Amino acid sequence: LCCGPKLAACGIVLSAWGVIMLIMLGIFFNVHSLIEDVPFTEKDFENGPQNIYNLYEQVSYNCFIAAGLYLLLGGFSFCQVRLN
Amino acid sequence: SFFPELYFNVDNGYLEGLVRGLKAGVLSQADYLNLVQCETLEDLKLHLQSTDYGNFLANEASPLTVSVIDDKLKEKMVVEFRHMRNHAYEPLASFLDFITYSYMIDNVILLITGTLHQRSIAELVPKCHPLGSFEQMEAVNIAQTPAELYNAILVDTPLAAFFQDCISEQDLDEMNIEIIRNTLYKAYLESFYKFCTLLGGTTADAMCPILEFEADRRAFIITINSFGTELSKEDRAKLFPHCGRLYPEGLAQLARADDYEQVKNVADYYPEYKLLFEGAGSNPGDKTLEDRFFEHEVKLNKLAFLNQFHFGVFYAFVKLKEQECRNIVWIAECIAQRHRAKIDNYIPIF
Amino acid sequence: TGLELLYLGIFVAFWACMIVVGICYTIFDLGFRFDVAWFLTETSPFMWSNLGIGLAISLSVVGAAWGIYITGSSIIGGGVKAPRIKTKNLVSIIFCEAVAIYGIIMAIVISNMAEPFSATDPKAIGHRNYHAGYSMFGAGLTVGLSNLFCGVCVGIVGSGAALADAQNPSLFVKILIVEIFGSAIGLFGVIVAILQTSRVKMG
Amino acid sequence: GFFSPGIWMGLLTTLFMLFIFTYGLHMILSLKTMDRFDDR
Amino acid sequence: LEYSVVFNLVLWIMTGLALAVIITSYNIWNMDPGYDSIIYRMT
Amino acid sequence: ELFRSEEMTNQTPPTYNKTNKFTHGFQNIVDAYGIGTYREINPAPYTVITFPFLFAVMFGDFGHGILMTLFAVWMVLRESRILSQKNENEMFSMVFSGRYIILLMGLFSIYTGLIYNDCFSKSLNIFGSSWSVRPMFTIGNWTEETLLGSSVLQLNPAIPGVFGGPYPFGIDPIWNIATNKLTFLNSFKMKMSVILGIIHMLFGVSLSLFNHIYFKKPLNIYFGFIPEIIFMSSLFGYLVILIFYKWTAYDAHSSRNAPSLLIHFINMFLFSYPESGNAMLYSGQKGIQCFLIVVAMLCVPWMLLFKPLILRHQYLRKKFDFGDTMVHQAIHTIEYCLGCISNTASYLRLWALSLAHAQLSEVLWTMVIHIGLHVRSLAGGLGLFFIFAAFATLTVAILLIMEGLSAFLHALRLHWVEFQNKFYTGTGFKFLPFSFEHIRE
Amino acid sequence: NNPEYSSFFGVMGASSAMVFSAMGAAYGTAKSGTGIAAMSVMRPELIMKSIIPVVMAGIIAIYGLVVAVLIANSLTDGITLYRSFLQLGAGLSVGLSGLAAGFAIGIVGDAGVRGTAQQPRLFVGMILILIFAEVLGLYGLIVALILSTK
Amino acid sequence: NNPEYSSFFGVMGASSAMVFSAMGAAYGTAKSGTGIAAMSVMRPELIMKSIIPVVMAGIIAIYGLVVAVLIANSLTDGITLYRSFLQLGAGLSVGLSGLAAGFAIGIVGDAGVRGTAQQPRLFVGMILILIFAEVLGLYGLIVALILSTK
Amino acid sequence: NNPEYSSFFGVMGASSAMVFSAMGAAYGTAKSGTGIAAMSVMRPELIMKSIIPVVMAGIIAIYGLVVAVLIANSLTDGITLYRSFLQLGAGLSVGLSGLAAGFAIGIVGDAGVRGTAQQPRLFVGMILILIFAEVLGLYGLIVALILSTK
Amino acid sequence: NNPEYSSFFGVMGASSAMVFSAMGAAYGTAKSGTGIAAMSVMRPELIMKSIIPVVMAGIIAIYGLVVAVLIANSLTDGITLYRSFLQLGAGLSVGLSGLAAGFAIGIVGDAGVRGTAQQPRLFVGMILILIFAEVLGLYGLIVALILSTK
Amino acid sequence: NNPEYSSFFGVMGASSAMVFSAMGAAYGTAKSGTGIAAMSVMRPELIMKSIIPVVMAGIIAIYGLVVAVLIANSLTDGITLYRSFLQLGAGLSVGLSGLAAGFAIGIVGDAGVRGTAQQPRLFVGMILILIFAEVLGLYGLIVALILSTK
Amino acid sequence: AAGFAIGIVGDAGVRGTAQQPRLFVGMILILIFAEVLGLYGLIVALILSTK
Amino acid sequence: NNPEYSSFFGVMGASSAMVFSAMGAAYGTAKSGTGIAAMSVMRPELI
């Protein structure tokens, strides 16, 4: 599909933004396993520091999945703008 | 009241600034003097180009004539009017429509008569005053049928309400054309005045004085000019507008009057007019009554710009420039005809 | 005039009903059933305070805002033939914001006095809190309305200034004196609002 | 009684904001468009 | 008991609804047919 | 040495300002307000930095600051392709012409965002957060507080004997996740905006002295600059000193009924000096408060009426509409004195817009991307994909474009009205030399 | 003791005085400024004489300030209500009376400027009329000052 | 022995009397000044005579001051209520009646001043009608004075 | 056993009787004066015999004065309420009835004087018509006098 | 211990902040679109520039969104009333402020679009005047934010 | 234990959201359709593009349908009142905001569609502005969704 | 509501019919719709008043 | 346990549903019919 090279280029930029930002998010949690403290915690939070390490690892996993989707999107958009 | 000075500039703020900015460009007494000190039409152009006027004779015939200066000046103010008329909203546009109506009235008088004496619309339209326009059809391609023009007017032409006095076509054929146009003008002035009084704020107080003057002006001048013609005194009275100072009492005396002195005797009861008849020396080499009326009318149109929150500034705007056009052409005519001693017959516009 | 007719009909019916109800309570010799003290005491001072604060800020910007477009339209229109106008006549708008600023400062200073009561039964509770509540309400209203009308004045005057300057550049400076009075009127409201809340306490 | 503290206070705030709504709507309704365009 | 509640509700509910009808009736009453096309000739 | 216009060839010349590929854009936004007086101090050399700085304060967002630069870089990278092409799109041309302005604006926005430690509402952890020692919190008679914590927050006390120490650089990241950031950080930015605004005004006034020297108008400083700067210093500089004093003089030990600089400032102007009931910042403050306000009044006669008074004195001795000159000077005095008060409020835009932006960033993050996260692995990852894509879209649509444009305009407003009006006065004519402009034709 | 809410009316008085006087001054000022600007385009030589109406408006604004300040300084918590009612009356008396005066100031100044624009000899007469409006503002102030001291 | 808030009615009387009278005089003054400014341009020599309607208006303002002060002096805390109703009636009676009179003063002066310029013989008729307006204002004053002492 | 507020109803009657009557007479006076001024331009000899509508307007004002004074003198503290309602009815009856007449007086006077200018024969007719308005005003007085003594 | 209805005032704040801001921005948008459509016919090259008033109005709409969301995320059941009135004030404060802002935006933009097309030198002034209105709207936002911590 | 009649507010929300949104879309639809009928007679080739205002108006109506249904499906008998206050806020927030957007749609549609026939380059400009009105409507939906589940 | 419809349609329809005799049938049909709108009211009233 | 007056609201609903929709349909019918009459005189073929 062509879709227009102007829109393929926009997708490439968004895809690069997605991969860069999402991987960074996972790293920050992986290193500080943190101020943000937004891993989607449970309300019934117990006295278990290991729960913060575990959820932070979950955030990294989920973030890298999102980046993987941006890698696929960027790849497709790359070929569109190059061929257009 | 507290009615004006509040919502006025919400929609009409731009036009008020623009129209006064345009007024700022009208020829001053100093500028008229520079136009007088020419004695040549080419120099007249060059001196006029010193103001907002000018650059309108460019690309025209190398010889400069009065007909070109006249037409071009009219065109300038028509364009400026249409601009402001188009960039306007019903609250103000309806007021402006009345101004255009005065010209439409004259134009429809032209459409009839010619229709009555087999003339085609296409031949008549080129001689109609601008702003009449008549973009509507049915008034166009009437097939030189008076009935078709009469019906098209009743239906499409905004002046249909005014023609309620002159109806059934029978009136068109049996009435003198000038009685028809004076009758229609009365209907216009009466409706327009009432409209101004419905806008019962600053506009009513700023606008009506001018309309009331015009109404009384018509009574005075019509009475005098009617002396030498064939017209029943009652039919003459029928043409006197009721929006003025003569209506309560005074028109009855003008209707009976058969002499200039009797008309002046009426003015004697109205100092604002008495002074005009006294100023109108009417000597063989002096100003006349019509000239004093123009001077008074302009004074009023200038005073109109003492109110910053009304519609009357636009009415005065058009009328003031119309006189300015008369003034400029007068100078061109004085040059063209070489009568320098008659140059000072323009009406100063301050 | 469809809207004006609606507004009038509501206005007349609103007060006409109040007259009938008021006089009826008197006629039927009710035991002061409509008790103003009751309304004033049950009505939480918190509403009165927060209302006055919102009024102080909200009314003041309305004034400024009103005047701004009054003078904006005149400047923009006239400026077509006199573009010089924007150089000097923008000060009219500065005066309009300045009227908003007067109210804005007071709105913040007043709101800085807002405190909780931890109060329940008004009986012998919050005697001072009612005074401070009503005072804050008044002071907010005082400055709000005063700035509201000032902003309208300044707009009207600034419009004339723009129209005048377009035709005579020498008139600008002299006219400025009128707008200064307009600003002073708003400052007078500020002085009173300051006094009204000069000795208040919340909580 | 006819009114409670709650009801009355609610009505007071309701009317204030109703007046604001009315003011805004008033000027919004009294808004016109152009009859014609100036030129081509 | 709870008079103030039914009272408050019914008064303001019926008042707002009644006005909506009154305004709607006004707007319908004064419908502008255009006063043109054939009206000028019948007038 | 200040930059001034070039000489042109006893009539008022046009103003000629030499510009280059980078500084031309800055001169234009100056010229947009007006053409400066011949031999006037050119504000543009100071705008080059001052304006980006004011933006960076208004747009203090580390993450968007980067994106903003990248946008400018894109345009610069195509500089050769954009110049040697047709550009009928004027909005593209304008932002292109301002591409070097935008880049700089981003550069400072990063600087200020870094100190604020906000990158899309993200803090910058330098391992220096030592504000409090949580281990000691529990020791201070807080045993199993996390059980009750399920329904409470609990604010960390000051000066418990175990807390203290500043964050190495910028605001301690811990405030980025606090529920009361809205008082700690909002207050700081409030005070910062006031301090910066006053300094900027004083700078603009100081420049007026150089202009007064260049045109050899000793009177413009004898009754102008001097009494004007005295007015401003005594009232506005004093306030700034008090703000720093408060920060350095009082600790939490006096947090209850701690002196309020707002109330003391108001009481200063009103000469209200209660004997007791309110703690003063320092002993004798009442005497200083009275002194400064009286002096501020004493300088006014010079600025208010003595200029036309001495001009009348000197005029009649050498031999001037005295009444008209009094009108001019009186209006000028009011504008300066009242404007300083109003201008100070103008610079509250730095706080207002910095806060407004911070509110957009915090809310846009919290109500868009945060909700996209979930404890379920695959659903969370895929959700973040779609939610983030929309999030990035909103960040651009709302903050990078619209708010960046707003902050541009508001900082430009401050330059034109509050800064320039202290020294950059009068008008000049457009400098239009013969040039070979018709190169393409 | 001193009942609650008693200060309410005195606060409304102090507020009313200032607001209504501001209304009066604002109307008279805006109307006068309009007329002055319109004249000065036609002839600037009358501008200085035409300024007084604007000050006249400001006087109404001060009138209101004098009472509003007098009350605002008098306002306390322990008000015996009687004093609050006196304050309410004084506030309304000066404010609403100044409003009427300011209206007259506006109308007369605006018409006066147009009158002088055509004939400068009207100046003295127009000022004398505005003097009556100032007297109307004074009467309001007088009554308000009397009431506040009862 | 007396009820609370009984003084409320009295202070409303003193205020109302002054406010309505100022509104009446202000209206008549505003209309008169407009007519004077418009007329005097054509007939400047009449400027010193056309002021009279404005004085007539000032009389309405005095009417109000007299009663408002008379009531104010009679305002106490221990008011018997009965007396307060009389004071309120007196205040409204003179104020509202003066308001009506001021309206007529305005309209009659406006028309009369211009009519006089166009008709010098109208001067006497104009004054006579203005005398009737003053009589209408007095009737209110008479009743108010009767009530305030009843 | 006398109901409180009984005096309120009463005093409101006396005031209303005066206020509404002045409103009517003032309206009729304002309209009559306007027509008279315009008429005087053409027919100055009629100015003096054109004042009658204004004198008649004053009759309406007196109608009101008489009742208001009769009530005011009748007002006491220990009023049995019954009398208070009669006083309110009497006040409204004469005041509002005279008010309506005042408009008739004004409108007919204006039209009559303007017409008389052209048709001097209209004068007897103008007066007869205005006589009917005077009769309408008296009817209100008659009922008010009956009620105030009942 | 929580006064009932305490949550009612709070919820209204969030709603008003959004509704009134939308009204203002919509008004400004409607006014601008009218001027833009009329102007753009003759000078289509100015279509892009003419959008600015609309973007500014859109900012007003955001201003409102920020408060409405901030309040909404701050609502609970056990609201202590004190907090509720702060939220209501915040909503109303930004609402009316944004509403007035939007009106100034719309009115000025309409004139500005026409003025700029006729005189491009007015472009900067158009932005400036709209800029001041946007600054006024910001104040409305900030005060709504300030109350959230009081 | 739950307050009675608590469902009233939530029910009014569901209905209010739908009605106000229909009012908004109806205005924009009627105003745009008028411009379409007036325009497309001259430029029939634009008949399939001038519908856009109307389509975008339908969006306002859907925004209301989504919330009105969301609210209705959220109502029960034993409502804790708190939830009902939220439901009314959400209903009004989207409804009245959609109403404001509907006005923008209508006015911009009319001006844009007729302008487009005069200048086809306006077509994109019209959409962009209408896009801003749609964004204004969206903000209302966002807040309503936030409140309705809060 | 039906009365409004009848009146407005009757006025325009009857006058139009003289100008266009072919309008008669269309006028009747439209008036029939207004009568149906009036009947809907009757139908609801009959069902409701008997419930 | 049933609140008295409770049925009042439901009855007003049944009425409002018909009254308001009737007002709308009546407006639309009358407004369209007027335009139709104007059309038919110009050309009945579209009636």
Swiss-Prot record, chain D:
Oligomeric and partner information: Accessory component of the multisubunit proton-transporting vacuolar (V)-ATPase protein pump. Interacts (via N-terminus) with ATP6AP2 (via N-terminus). Interacts with RNASEK. Interacts with TMEM106B (via C-terminus).
Residue intervals passing through the bilayer: 1-21
Task of the protein: Accessory subunit of the proton-transporting vacuolar (V)-ATPase protein pump, which is required for luminal acidification of secretory vesicles. Guides the V-type ATPase into specialized subcellular compartments, such as neuroendocrine regulated secretory vesicles or the ruffled border of the osteoclast, thereby regulating its activity. Involved in membrane trafficking and Ca(2+)-dependent membrane fusion. May play a role in the assembly of the V-type ATPase complex.
Segments on the Cytoplasmic side according to the record's topology features: 22-40
UniProt organism field: Rattus norvegicus (Rat)
Cellular localisation: Endoplasmic reticulum membrane; Endoplasmic reticulum-Golgi intermediate compartment membrane; Cytoplasmic vesicle, Secretory vesicle, Synaptic vesicle membrane; Cytoplasmic vesicle, Clathrin-coated vesicle membrane
Tissues with expression: Expressed in brain (at protein level).
Post-translational modification comment from the UniProt entry: N-glycosylated.
Family: Belongs to the vacuolar ATPase subunit S1 family.
Protein name (database record): V-type proton ATPase subunit S1
Curated annotation (Swiss-Prot), chain E:
Span of the entire protein shown here: 301 to 343 of 350
Organism of provenance: Rattus norvegicus
Ranges annotated as spanning the membrane: 3-23
Disulfide bonds: none
Protein name per Swiss-Prot or TrEMBL: Renin receptor cytoplasmic fragment
Superkingdom to which the source organism belongs: Eukaryota
Regions of this protein lying in the Cytoplasmic compartment: 24-43
Swiss-Prot record, chain F:
Disulfide bridge positions per record: none
PTM annotation (Phosphothreonine): residues: 12
Topology, Vacuolar side: 60-61, 124-187, 247-291, 359-379
InterPro entries (alphabetical): V-ATPase_116kDa_su (IPR002490), V-type_ATPase_116kDa_su_euka (IPR026028)
GO molecular function: ATPase binding; proton-transporting ATPase activity, rotational mechanism
Record's keyword terms, sorted: Cytoplasmic vesicle, Hydrogen ion transport, Ion transport, Membrane, Phosphoprotein, Synapse, Transmembrane, Transmembrane helix, Transport
Cytoplasmic side: 79-93, 208-225, 419-441
Transport recorded as keyword: yes
GO cellular component: clathrin-coated vesicle membrane; cytoplasm; melanosome; membrane; perinuclear region of cytoplasm; plasma membrane; synaptic vesicle membrane; terminal bouton
Family under the similarity heading: Belongs to the V-ATPase 116 kDa subunit family.
Quaternary organization: V-ATPase is a heteromultimeric enzyme made up of two complexes: the ATP-hydrolytic V1 complex and the proton translocation V0 complex. The V1 complex consists of three catalytic AB heterodimers that form a heterohexamer, three peripheral stalks each consisting of EG heterodimers, one central rotor including subunits D and F, and the regulatory subunits C and H. The proton translocation complex V0 consists of the proton transport subunit a, a ring of proteolipid subunits c9c'', rotary subunit d, subunits e and f, and the accessory subunits ATP6AP1/Ac45 and ATP6AP2/PRR. Interacts with SPAAR.
Protein name: V-type proton ATPase 116 kDa subunit a 1
Annotated gene: Atp6v0a1
Swiss-Prot record, chain M:
Topology Cytoplasmic: residue spans: 29-47
Modifications after synthesis and translation: Ubiquitinated by RNF182, leading to its degradation via the ubiquitin-proteasome pathway.
UniProt subcellular location: Cytoplasmic vesicle, Clathrin-coated vesicle membrane; Cytoplasmic vesicle, Secretory vesicle, Synaptic vesicle membrane
Protein name: V-type proton ATPase 16 kDa proteolipid subunit c
Record field: transmembrane: 6-28
Quaternary structure, from the entry: V-ATPase is a heteromultimeric enzyme made up of two complexes: the ATP-hydrolytic V1 complex and the proton translocation V0 complex. The V1 complex consists of three catalytic AB heterodimers that form a heterohexamer, three peripheral stalks each consisting of EG heterodimers, one central rotor including subunits D and F, and the regulatory subunits C and H. The proton translocation complex V0 consists of the proton transport subunit a, a ring of proteolipid subunits c9c'', rotary subunit d, subunits e and f, and the accessory subunits ATP6AP1/Ac45 and ATP6AP2/PRR.
Homology family: Belongs to the V-ATPase proteolipid subunit family.
Tissues/organs with expression: Expressed in brain (at protein level).
